[PDB]
Amino acid sequence: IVGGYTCGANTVPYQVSLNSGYHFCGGSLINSQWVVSAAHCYKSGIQVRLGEDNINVVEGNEQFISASKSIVHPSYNSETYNNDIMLIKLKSAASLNSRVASISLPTSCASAGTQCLISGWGNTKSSGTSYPDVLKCLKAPILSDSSCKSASSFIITSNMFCAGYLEGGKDACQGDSGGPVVCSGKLQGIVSWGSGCAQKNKPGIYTKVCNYVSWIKQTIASN
Template sequence: MMNLLKCLCCVLLDLLAVRGRVLPHSRIVGGYPAAPNSIKYIVSLQSTSGQHFCGGSLVHRAEQIMIVAGDYRVNYFEGTEQYAKPNRLVTHPLYNRSTNNADIMLIKLRAPMVLNKYVSLAPLPRQGTGLFEGHVCRVSGWGYNSLGGGQVPVTLRTVAVPIVSTARCNSSDSFDGNITANMICAGYRTGGKDACKGDSGGPLVCAGRVYGVVSWGNGCGDARFPGVYTAVSRFRRWIDQTIYGSFLRCSRQ
């Protein structure tokens, strides 16, 4: 049972769901290995056997999943890792599996992560804050790093991608109207650099804040189809209400 008397961290990540328009394997494509422990807010979601399957971000201090912070090489113990079990999973009430709209979830941990030189928080944008086309952001994850799949890299990788306007992303040459106001597109006109389903939940960081969460796409690194991310600023109010609502309930018990 959930113990609301603890002060817990929350992890922002996307809903783990089957998306027919996404390649069965996902990866950071066209990027490079991040410097060790340079992306301190990213976490690895792993099965109880230690297999990485999704990413996430620590966004607020505070059964078959383990959240691992401070990780750099998954499946290798480096002494910098912190482990926590989930206590509560909160799916956004408007999530639509068919359209991937409102593709976001919060996880409350059973115990807090300790902030140190390997683990830190990621600031969030204000409610409704937008981004201009061409603004360069950074996405990170432990997914595959080639279009053909192959071995999953154990080292955290990262790549810079520019924001694509909703109008261009929604054009008949691209997603043809399937991009909602709750989504952000990012990628190059020439393709080749992207994140896909395997990096699901990973952070798209712009100007030091988590503006996006890896959500879905069509292929990977395709010039016609940029990566699609959940627009975090559209859900800031819900995130705050969910987090602080739990703390208020805690204080009343």
């Protein structure tokens, strides 16, 4: 997260870190046994880390639980990032508490102008690299598709939305992928892609979760 602020320990209790020896992506807890993340974060050997603030220090509220199954969206396209969404089932149910909590799925989509909270342990620099230990947070509005497309020349699909600031300075970044975009109390986005970080006319691109709620619910019900 570039241009954000330190969230405060466990103030984003649905945020998870995906760990394969090191943090590599974020995710969001959606019930005690399931996490949603980005398909482009797919790999084997995932340990889900819940209750994290400082990812390099055991602070006392963590739960580390191995993935038992990962399900990349049936239509995920790695070249375009269309349908950049994945479900991860935990081997055992997380113990839910004030620091480890699910985030509600939307029943309807969000609109341009609505403010969202984006969070993660990704790079905090727009030029060069610095990776934080504690969770970072950013408030950012959803942009209209037309404004985003015209400003950026990005090729996106109806399964994506742009959020952020066309002037630059505030954005998600490498290492935030898979993590949450929460708007009006609902998980509306997943950190998906962009070009650089926090550059002028290059806002963040997010998977549009409202298009996937039926797939999420049916997949969890059957698995």
